[PDB]
């Protein structure tokens, strides 16, 4: 009855690293948008709510990482693939702080309220990548219109630093591919079309045609220039 409070803790920390726990069963579904996790019946109504409170933070990260870490690796190699791999780069250091916490969990020194205050800056870190993760799978957007959406998302966002910090960074690290092949196109002039990444495509001149569904994100005058 005091042991069950640690027995749910060790069950919880394996849920946090995105994998199946001991008695917290995980329900997978296609198009999950934060799949649900089924907790066990327990002996005290207060201690379940504390693991019910940390669980969406474990839920929303583990799902929105999981498909962007795999669908990007399956997909082409456009600006959406350098974007999703940078989410995977940020996901490397998230698993590091959990393991340094487990070095302090060789013997019980923390409880559930100590778990949530430590992951409180990181639950705001994952959840603005969560709204990216829902729209890019409903739309399945193309590379000119991916950066156009991803620009607009980090822009009507204020209120916290470290969420605004990353959601600039990875979109800036998606715009910086775009600017370089723009600079290959405005200086040398060789375009590399893997599949397509631009509004402008080759073919009394009919050499170039523009589509309005692959426009960049900035105001339409610079795309015309």
């Amino acid at each position: 009855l005091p042991s069950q409070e640690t027995c749910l803790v060790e069950d919880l920390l394996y849920i946090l690293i995105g994998v199946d726990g001991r008695y917290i069963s995980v329900q997978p579904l296609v198009g999950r948008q934060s799949r649900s996790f089924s907790v066990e019946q327990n002996l005290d109504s207060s201690v379940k709510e504390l693991v019910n409170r940390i669980l969406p933070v474990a839920t929303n990260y583990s799902t929105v990482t999981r498909f962007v870490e795999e669908n990007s690796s399956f997909e082409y190699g456009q600006v959406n693939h350098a974007l999703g791999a940078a989410m995977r780069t940020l996901g490397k250091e998230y698993m590091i702080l959990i393991s340094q916490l487990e070095h302090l969990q060789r013997q019980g020194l923390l409880s559930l309220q100590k778990l949530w205050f430590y992951i409180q800056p990181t639950l705001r870190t994952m959840e603005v990548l969560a709204s990216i993760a829902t729209s890019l799978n409903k739309g399945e957007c193309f590379g000119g219109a991916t950066l156009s959406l991803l620009h607009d998302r980090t822009f009507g966002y204020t209120g916290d630093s470290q969420a605004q910090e990353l959601c600039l960074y990875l979109t800036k690290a998606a715009s910086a591919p775009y600017f370089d092949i723009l600079e290959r196109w405005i200086y040398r002039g060789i375009i590399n079309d893997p599949y397509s990444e631009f509004m402008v495509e080759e073919h009394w001149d009919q050499r170039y045609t523009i589509v309005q569904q692959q426009i960049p994100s900035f105001l339409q005058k610079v795309a015309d220039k």
Binding site: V9, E10, D11, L13, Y14, I15, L16, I17, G18, V19, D20, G21, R22, Y23, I24, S25, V26, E40, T65, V68, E69, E70, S72, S73, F74, E75, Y76, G77, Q78, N80, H81, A82, L83, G84, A85, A86, M87, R88, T89, G91, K92, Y94, M95, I96, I98, S99, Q100, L101, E102, H103, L104, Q105, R106, Q107, G143, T146, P177, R188, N192, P194
Partner: protein, 289 residues
């Protein structure tokens, strides 16, 4: 608790540890045979299931071919990468045992998640291996170039390390055949198979076919006919009673510069600047001829 922590190390290094899992396919599921324990243990046994199985699939591919000298070109240069990112999985396996022993010992959800960064690392090598069952070059160059057209520079940087290494036998066929032209094929790893027809006197007959079924996707169609055009002219100046590399010994300095540039350069395969100075060799070798 900790005995299941000890069991999860041995399937990370390989096949089953404390108990028998009896499955090499579709995931490596831990069977404990206990019902009186909590049902929450079983789902973390199912977290381990696709960690160990996705590790042994990388051992399965490189050991089922069981290294072969036939098609021993670009295929095993792809395997030499496949052992260096096999290597990167093992380095996080050693920090997990230094957590285990005393020098803390309990591994909880911290490392439970630490493990999913190997997972997305191994899923990158899983998508890399599912494309290619064969080890013949040329079609490997259209494989990793189809993986870099995908965006999201997390695994796109990793397959950029592979396209810089898959191409590294491919472009090693090129610039020596531009600079000296001494034929070095055994199984035609390049799309230009040099001398598959018996030697005849030159009636402008095409001995160097370009073979559409093995074209790299970073080399476009006007460049594949271009490197044939320099490779056909470099052989016509060998039998002109001259062994002189075109118009100077500066063609031999160029190969050395390129090999140091490749040495200094991180992993990237150049294709927009690579096609530029072969113009400066193509216009060079044509006027001297």
């Amino acid at each position: 608790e900790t005995s299941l922590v000890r069991d999860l190390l041995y399937v990370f290094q390989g096949i089953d540890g404390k108990f028998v899992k009896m499955c090499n396919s579709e995931n490596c599921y831990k069977v404990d045979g206990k019902v009186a324990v909590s049902k929450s243990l079983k789902d973390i046994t199912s977290k381990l299931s696709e960690l160990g199985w996705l590790h042994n699939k990388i051992k399965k591919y490189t050991d089922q071919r069981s290294l072969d000298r036939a098609f021993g070109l670009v295929g095993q240069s792809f395997c030499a990468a496949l052992h260096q990112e096999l290597k990167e999985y093992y380095r996080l396996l050693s920090v997990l045992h230094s957590q285990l022993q005393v020098e803390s010992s309990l591994t909880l959800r911290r490392l439970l998640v630490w493990t999913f960064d190997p997972k997305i690392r191994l899923k990158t090598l899983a998508a890399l291996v599912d494309h290619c069952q064969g080890r013949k070059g040329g079609e490997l160059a259209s494989a990793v170039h189809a993986y870099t057209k995908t965006g999201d520079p997390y695994m796109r940087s990793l397959v950029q390390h592979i396209l810089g290494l898959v191409a590294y036998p491919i472009l090693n066929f090129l610039y020596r055949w531009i600079y000296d032209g001494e034929l070095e094929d055994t199984y035609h790893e390049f799309f230009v198979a040099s001398d598959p027809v018996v030697k005849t006197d030159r009636l402008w007959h095409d001995k160097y076919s370009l073979r559409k079924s093995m074209i790299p996707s970073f080399m476009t169609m006007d460049q594949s006919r271009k490197v044939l055009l320099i490779g056909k002219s470099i052989n016509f100046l060998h039998q002109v009673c001259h062994d002189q590399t075109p118009a100077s010994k500066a063609m031999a300095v160029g190969k050395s510069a390129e090999s140091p540039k490749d040495a200094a350069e991180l992993f990237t395969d150049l294709e927009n600047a690579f096609q530029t100075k072969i113009d400066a060799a193509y216009f060079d070798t044509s006027k001297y001829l």
